[PDB]
Amino acid sequence: MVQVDGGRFATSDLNDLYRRLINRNNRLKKLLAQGAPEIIIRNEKRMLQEAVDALLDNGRRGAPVTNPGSDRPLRSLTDILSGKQGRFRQNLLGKRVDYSGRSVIVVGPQLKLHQCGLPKRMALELFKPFLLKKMEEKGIAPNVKAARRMLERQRDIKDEVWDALEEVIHGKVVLLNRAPTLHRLGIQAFQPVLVEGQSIQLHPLVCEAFNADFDGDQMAVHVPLSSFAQAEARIQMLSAHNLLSPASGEPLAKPSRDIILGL
Amino acid sequence: TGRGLSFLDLIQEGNQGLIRAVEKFEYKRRFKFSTYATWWIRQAINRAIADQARTIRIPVHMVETINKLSRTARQLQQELGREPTYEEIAEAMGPGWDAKRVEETLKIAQEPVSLETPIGDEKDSFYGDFIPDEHLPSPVDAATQSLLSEELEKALSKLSEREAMVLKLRKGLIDGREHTLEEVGAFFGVTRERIRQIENKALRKLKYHESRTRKLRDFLD
């Protein structure tokens, strides 16, 4: 039971469901010492049972409204584990991740297969921990806490910051995910090329594999962190390392549309 | 029916008052039992509702103050053809009631909203998913607080182990307790005013280490 921005309280459905059980337990306790007849005691023990059923798996008998006001079932212990939304598919078999971004994709004709366009401002925040370090070895900040306060407001961005960001990214690669993520090649590791402007520049041949077009298609970026995660990305995951389909043995990156026509 | 208690709970709480009445009933009075039972049933149900109908629980006297506040607001709506001001109710609620009191009562009467309240017509989103966790320190915060104990341990090396220990003991960096000067005098072998003197000179040597180095400054917040 927490206080939101407005000061108001927001409580979990499990709390009105536990207070229901507690109440029927503590009235059942009172009735039995008061020596109630068997027709009342029958009743109170039956209700103690649809409190335990509402709590554990609700909707397996009839569904408790939080109040008559919302006909929304109170979300119970079972409801929380099972579902698309359940604790399992939502939380344990996939997560929201820390270093990641999203943008609109735009055609990449110039970049080499293994490369892709990354807007300045995305690359800044994605590598922000690495950049605060690189700002310390080069002189642009006394330390981290100073360097961080320097990047907080947008007029405070120095030219050396940028020329230092280039120093960070060297050799590293990132992952591009267009969803639907249908098969393995729907996430490919590219080496980023910092570009001005606000969108991502995708390489033409991999467009077909991702089922990307630019109708306004958007793609997510993730940053592999460990010196391990890097090796994985750059060796196996690279866009230029997977040129055939795992599905049939046939070439996945093939001359596509303008390119077939050109030739 | 609709007051925050389920039917069966209202019946059970009512039954509990039927029992109170069976023990209090004097048959010599010519009244039929139904007359006397009715009073105790209505009393135990109203106690019950006022007790159990709120997630954030409110005292019984306080409950009916808020209720009286509601009915008075409602009456004033019926009269004014619109919802009343805090001050319009405060008048109608008689002496001792100002706008400030009518307001604070209302805020105290605010019931909590389920975190599972759906967002959008799709089943996909919940309210409590958009609610951040303010308690547990973000990675930034935890990183900063460590770089603080590192920066304080680097600037306490410039002091001798005695004068740095006067400070380490007195502000609670060790064990989490702040010791009075007589205690740092009992541990070191110095008199209480001598440990106030080597605490002041060590704090002063720190001030020069800071004005010269420009390290601890960024922690100004």
Partner: peptide, 14 residues
Amino acid sequence: SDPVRQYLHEIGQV
């Protein structure tokens, strides 16, 4: 099922 309905009939026995 329907505990209201069943309780009522349990009450209607007396």
